[PDB]
C-alpha cells in the first residue's frame, strides 16, 4: 500500500449566496464577533484557513458556531477555549458546511449584504449552499445534454428545453454559482427552479430565492441531481420535441447525462 499525506493549513474564500463571501464583521479579530455575508474582496476577514483538525479561522481566531441549536448564529473566538464541538466543521462536495456534532449547517436565511449566518436544520436550500475557493468567480458554461443538444433558457417562469447548441445564444449560457445554483448568465436573477419533488415534475427558470428546488448538485456520474429530492433532471421521454426537462429517478441512462462545457 501507500498512505496519502496529511495536508497543511490552506487559506481559501467562502461563497454561497448571490456571489457574496463569508467574513468576520468589521474584520475585528475580537472574540464573539459574528459571521456575515459580504461582497468578496482582498481582506483577511474574508480569508479562511482550513486545518486538518477540522477548524476554519480568519485572523487566527477559530470560526465557531457560538450558541448551539437550530437558529444559533456563527462567530469567531479563540481556538483553545472554543467549545470542542462548536469549532469542528465538515465541507462535503454537496456544497454545504455541516457542523459534525450538531448536524446543523451554515445557513444564510437571506442573501443581503451584511446578513449574519447561522447553524440551521439542513434542508437542502441554495441558502445552505457554500463553495470554498479563492476564485469567487463562477464559470460560464453550456449544459449539453441529450443528442449533443444544449439546454436552453426561455422566459421568466417559462420552461427550459434542449435546443440546438449555439455558443453565441446567451439563452444557453449558464452561470454556475458557488451557492450550488444554476442561473442565467444574461440575468443571474433567475435560478433553474423545479415545480415539485415528484418524478415528471417540470423544471423551469423561476426567480432566485434559495429555495430547496434551486439547489443543484453535479454528480460525478454526469447527472445533475436535485438535492432535496433524489430526482435528477432529464429529457422527458427523450422526445426533445416535447420541450421539457424534468426531475426523474436516476436510471443511469444518457437522457439524464449532462456535460458542462466552458465559455
Amino acid at each position: 500500500g501507500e498512505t496519502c499525506a496529511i495536508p497543511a493549513p490552506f487559506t481559501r474564500r467562502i461563497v454561497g449566496r448571490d456571489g457574496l463571501c463569508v467574513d468576520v464583521r468589521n474584520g475585528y479579530d475580537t472574540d464573539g464577533t459574528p459571521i456575515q455575508l459580504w461582497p468578496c474582496g482582498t481582506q483577511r476577514n474574508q480569508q479562511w484557513t482550513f486545518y486538518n483538525d477540522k477548524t476554519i479561522r480568519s485572523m487566527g481566531k477559530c470560526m465557531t458556531a457560538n450558541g448551539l441549536n437550530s437558529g444559533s448564529y456563527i462567530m469567531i473566538t479563540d481556538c483553545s477555549t472554543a467549545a470542542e464541538d462548536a469549532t469542528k466543521w465538515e465541507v462535503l462536495i454537496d456544497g454545504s458546511i455541516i457542523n459534525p456534532s450538531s448536524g446543523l449547517v451554515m445557513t444564510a436565511p437571506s442573501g443581503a449584504s451584511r446578513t449574519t449566518l447561522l447553524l440551521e436544520n439542513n434542508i437542502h436550500a441554495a441558502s445552505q449552499g457554500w463553495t470554498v475557493s479563492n476564485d469567487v468567480q463562477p464559470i460560464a458554461t453550456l449544459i449539453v445534454g441529450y443528442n449533443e443538444m444544449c439546454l436552453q433558457a426561455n422566459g421568466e417562469n417559462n420552461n427550459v428545453w434542449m435546443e440546438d447548441c449555439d455558443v453565441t445564444s446567451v439563452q444557453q449560457q449558464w452561470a454556475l454559482f458557488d451557492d450550488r445554483t444554476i442561473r442565467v448568465n444574461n440575468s443571474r436573477g433567475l435560478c433553474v427552479t423545479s415545480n415539485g419533488y415528484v418524478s415528471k415534475d417540470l423544471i423551469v427558470i423561476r426567480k432566485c430565492q434559495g429555495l430547496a428546488t434551486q439547489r443543484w448538485f453535479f454528480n460525478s456520474d454526469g447527472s445533475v441531481v436535485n438535492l432535496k429530492s433524489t430526482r435528477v433532471m432529464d429529457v422527458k421521454e427523450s422526445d426533445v420535441s416535447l420541450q421539457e426537462v424534468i426531475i426523474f429517478p436516476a436510471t443511469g441512462n444518457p437522457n439524464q447525462q449532462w456535460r458542462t462545457q466552458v465559455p
Partner: protein, 252 residues
C-alpha cells in the same frame, strides 16, 4: 492472453457510437471499489494481474482498414499497436507487453517513448497543432496501418481515446467534431488538463471522498493562456469533466 477489446468504426459512426465506445473502455480499465467522489481510481501494478494488464482498442478507419492499440489498464496508456502481422512498442517496451501483446506478429520496437513530449518531438510538431477529428482519425489509423505507424498519427489517437476516456471535456470536443464532421486543434485548456492528470489526481485523493476543497491547487489554463487555478473538486469536474482518476496515494 486474449485480452478483452472495444471497437469503433469511423464508417457509419455517430457521436453516440463514439460516446458509447468510450464508456465500454472505461468499464474495462476502471474497476475496483477504490474511488473518490464517484470517480474510480485505476488499479496499480501490485493490484492487477497480467491476465488483465492490457485492454485492446480496435479502431476501424473509413476504408475498413482497422488498426488495434493496446491500453495499459493501470493508467489508460497506449502501450502498443499492431497492423497486419506487425506490432510496435515504444523505446521503453517492457518484457510484460513485449511478451504478451500481439503474439505472432513482428516485434519491432519504435524509437521514442509514449511520453507526450517524446511524440511531439518525434512528429516534428506539438499537440497544439495536430488537429483531431473524424477525418484526422482516418488519416491516423491509415498512417499507422500502412506507413508503419509514425508519431503524429499516434498523437492523434492518444488524445481521441485515452484522453477522452478520462476527460469528458475532450469527449464532447470530439463528439461535436464527428457530429459536425469537422476537425479541431487542442486548446490551452484541453492541453492543460491533459498535462495535469497526475496533479489533479492526487489533489483529489488528498481531500478524500465527499471533500470539496483541495489541499492545494490545480494549474489549468484558459484559452488566452492565462492561468486557471481550481482549488475545489466541483470546479475541476464542471470544467475538465474528469471521469477517471490515476492512483497516487491511498485513502487515510
Amino acid at each position: 492472453i486474449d485480452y478483452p477489446s472495444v471497437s469503433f468504426n469511423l464508417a457509419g459512426a455517430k457521436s453516440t457510437t463514439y460516446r458509447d465506445f468510450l464508456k465500454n473502455l472505461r468499464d474495462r480499465v476502471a474497476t475496483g471499489t477504490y474511488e473518490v467522489n464517484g470517480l474510480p481510481v485505476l488499479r496499480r501494478e501490485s493490484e492487477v494481474q497480467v491476465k488483465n494488464r492490457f485492454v485492446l482498442v480496435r479502431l476501424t478507419n473509413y476504408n475498413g482498414d482497422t488498426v488495434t492499440s493496446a491500453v495499459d489498464v493501470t493508467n489508460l496508456y497506449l502501450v502498443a499497436f499492431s497492423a497486419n502481422g506487425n506490432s510496435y512498442f515504444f523505446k521503453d517496451a517492457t518484457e510484460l507487453q513485449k511478451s504478451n501483446l500481439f503474439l505472432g506478429t513482428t516485434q519491432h520496437t519504435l524509437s521514442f517513448t509514449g511520453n507526450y513530449d517524446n511524440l511531439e518531438t518525434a512528429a516534428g510538431t506539438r499537440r497544439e497543432s495536430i488537429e483531431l477529428g473524424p477525418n484526422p482519425l482516418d488519416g491516423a489509423i491509415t498512417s499507422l496501418w500502412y506507413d508503419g505507424g509514425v508519431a503524429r498519427s499516434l498523437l492523434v489517437l492518444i488524445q481521441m481515446v485515452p484522453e477522452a476516456a478520462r476527460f469528458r471535456y475532450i469527449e464532447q470536443e470530439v463528439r461535436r467534431s464527428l457530429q459536425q464532421l469537422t476537425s479541431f486543434t487542442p486548446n490551452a485548456l484541453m492541453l492543460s488538463m491533459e498535462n495535469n492528470w497526475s496533479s489533479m489526481s492526487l489533489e483529489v485523493q488528498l481531500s478524500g471522498d465527499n471533500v470539496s476543497p483541495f489541499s492545494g491547487t490545480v494549474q489549468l489554463q484558459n484559452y488566452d493562456h492565462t492561468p486557471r487555478l481550481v482549488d475545489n473538486f466541483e470546479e475541476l469536474y464542471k470544467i475538465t469533466g474528469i471521469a477517471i482518476l490515476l492512483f497516487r496515494c491511498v485513502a487515510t
